[PDB]
Structures are given as C-alpha cells and as structure tokens.
Amino acid sequence: GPRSMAPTPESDKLKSEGNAAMARKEYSKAIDLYTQALSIAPANPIYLSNRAAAYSASGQHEKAAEDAELATVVDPKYSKAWSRLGLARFDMADYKGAKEAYEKGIEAEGNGGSDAMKRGLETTKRKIEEANRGAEPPADDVDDAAGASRG
C-alpha cells in the first residue's frame, strides 16, 4: 500500500539520529539522515529546517536556503524555518533577503522573536546601514593653503 506521506516513529528516529550527528559535528551524516527522514515524510518543515542547519554548518548556504525556503512555504507559521532562512541568506550576503526572513520569523514567533532572530535582524540591519551610509569614510580635500599659514 501507499505511505502516509507523514511523519512516523521511523522518520522521527532518523531525525533524532540526525540531531545526534549534528552534535558530533558529522554534518554529512546528518544531511543523509535527515534526507532519509524526508524520504518518509517529504517536505516536513521540521526535518527540512534541521537539514538546513546541517547544510549551513557545512558551508552549503544555497542548499540551506532552499531547505529553509521550502519549510517556510509549507509552514509559514514555523518561526525556526525563517530563522534558518535568515542565516542562510545572510551567509550568502543577501542582506535584504535576510532582513525579510528575520522579520517574518519574528512575526511567526509571536513573542518579539527568539534571541537569534532579534540579534539576526539587528545585525542584518546594521550591515545594510553600513552600506547605505558608506563603508568607507570620505577623504578631505588636499590643502591649497600656504605652508606658513599655520604659524
């Protein structure tokens, strides 16, 4: 018969084994274990957001972003997915997109945001303001005054 396409004790075991792999910093294994969980329950936002964390830890920001995005599409009310998406976009230097993700995460979280979301949004805004105001100070003009004018 057909699978239920929803989480099972088996998929959750795989998720837990994935979580343990993360703890050991075995990111490639975590990615594989979360993927196995997702083969049982496709597009599960918890499993997706966990695999996103593993991608991010291993420096694979585009893959992290795709997992996190899909999670936010499936469950836009799941604040953790937005936090994952924010970090992934931040790490891709997509600061506008990171700002948007953190803002939506903060709304979904329903309590002003997790510490990570609040700091994430603050840091992203500061980066955007740095760019807007100029990342480099202006230089003052060279002096055309006479050398003895300071005397």
Resolution to 1 decimal, in Å? Answer: 1.7
Provide the residue range defining the domain that includes 25: 1-151
The answer to whether residues 47 and 11 touch, using CB atoms and an 8 Å cutoff, is yes
Residue 34, judged by CB atoms within 10 A of its CB (0-12, 13-18, 19+), counts as buried
113 Rama sector, left if φ>0, alpha if ψ -120 to 50, beta otherwise = left
Looking at the structure of the chain, the number of domains it has is 1
* CATH number, domain containing residue 4: 1.25.40.10
Nearest Cα residue to 16 out of 34, 32, 4: 34
Structural biology method used: X-ray
List of residues 6+ apart from 44 with CB closer than 8 A: 7, 11, 37, 38, 74
The candidate with the shortest Cα–Cα distance to 75, out of 99, 105, 34, is 105
Give CA torsion, residues 70, 72, 76, 78, to 10 deg: 120
Percent helix, strand and coil across the chain, each rounded to 5?
A: 70, 0, 30
